[PDB]
Design a protein around this ligand. Structure first.
Ligand SMILES: C[C@H]1CCN(CCOc2ccc([C@@H]3c4ccc(O)cc4CC[C@@H]3c3ccccc3)cc2)C1
Ligand SMILES: C[C@H]1CCN(CCOc2ccc([C@@H]3c4ccc(O)cc4CC[C@@H]3c3ccccc3)cc2)C1
Lengths: 208, 212
């Protein structure tokens, strides 16, 4: 029944679905980020459940979707809040790191670049939550399958609706749509590069 | 001077630019490498006939091909594999199913097969296909020169939209399908990444000499 949402209801539903911005433990850099990510993962699951259409999926469908998307969700979230701090990544309000402290400057330079990209594009928060939802439903998808594609189509409708209300021309609307979606493919890329470094060292999702 | 180009002529240019289909020559990893290596040459010549590409500095052209070359091979493979369900047409004389796919390679195979199915379900057209392939070339390595590329990318999106509108898809159906196509590109990024991993655990000089 979640496919009956109007575009504005979809946005409002996504905005209040938003997870908090966590802080880093006050009182060895990888640990701080690992600790942060672990705590971040917990609200991400309660977030995903509030994504329209998500809970309709069988629970092992939900688990496959989250296992594929989670690092991308983390990455776009980080990049999102890092937007208004050029040359730096805001992992937490008390943990704002620069280029030099990165040394993973391979992945960080990528993360910074994406942040610059969102900034030049002047990405709005309303567009942001759509993109994050898109990532959840799309990264893992390669009755159940088509429902997902129907949900994805609704988010597309919503994104366009946002751009029309913003006063962008029809041409500008599908161009901006194209630009944002291509950016997702470089978030996929980052996740992957992030993943293999992440094993230069899967089931709590059902439990959660 | 390639941006001064109507959507129809744009599709024309890309279509005629299409590379030929090549024939097949760890028996198999030696077969796919020879084929891919041969396929790689025609890709350079294809890339140069892609609108906006030769206006780029040579250093950037190499960089784009370095980032994208595997993605190009994969989507092309996926493309000609459409009408052959459950199989991969690496070549007219080399048609494989996933059984023959079996080290580390069956997972990549299955990914390529799903992509092929998705194109089949969506019923991807040739006009659209060549548009996507261009987007990959210019998008994959995108991270005066770095906005020219974004103009071309916008021009190709117009072209895609142009095609869906002519087809009779409504404005809503148009942007829905545009999105459906571009999201598939992120799967192809993923396949390429896992592909690079799988190849290291077993190009520039060519690209530079190749782009004589
Ligand atoms: C999925 C859980 C399994 C146990 N945990 C492993 C650590 O997971 C991460 C994921 C991301 C990071 C870094 C980070 C942390 C918080 C955040 O909001 C965003 C990011 C962006 C990725 C970043 C990173 C990138 C590449 C290698 C390591 C860490 C660190 C650890 C997380
Ligand atoms: C950069 C060039 C110089 C070194 N060469 C290494 C060979 O790279 C490849 C690329 C693709 C493949 C397989 C293939 C062959 C032909 C084709 O038209 C498409 C593809 C898609 C990928 C496929 C592959 C890629 C990676 C691991 C296993 C299989 C195999 C070897 C390529």
């Amino acid at each position: 029944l979640a496919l009956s949402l109007t575009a504005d209801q979809m946005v409002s539903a996504l905005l209040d679905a938003e997870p908090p911005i966590l802080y880093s433990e006050y009182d060895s850099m990888m640990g701080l980020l690992t600790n942060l990510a672990d705590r971040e993962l917990v609200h991400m699951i309660n977030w995903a459940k509030r994504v329209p259409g998500f809970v309709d999926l069988t629970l092992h469908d939900q688990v496959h979707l989250l296992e594929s998307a989670w690092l991308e969700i983390l990455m776009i979230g980080l990049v999102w809040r890092s937007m208004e701090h050029p040359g730096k990544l805001l992992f937490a309000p008390n943990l704002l790191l620069d280029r030099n402290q990165g040394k993973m400057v391979e992945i960080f330079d990528m993360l910074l670049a994406t942040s610059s990209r969102f900034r030049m594009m002047n990405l709005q928060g309303e567009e942001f939550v759509c993109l994050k939802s898109i990532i959840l439903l799309n990264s893992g998808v390669y009755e159940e399958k088509d429902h997902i594609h129907r949900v994805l189509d609704k988010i597309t409708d919503t994104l366009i609706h946002l751009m029309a209300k913003a006063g962008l021309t029809l041409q500008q609307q599908h161009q901006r749509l194209a630009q944002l979606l291509l950016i997702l493919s470089h978030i996929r890329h980052m996740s992957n590069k992030g993943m293999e470094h992440l094993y230069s060292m899967s089931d709590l999702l059902l439990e959660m």
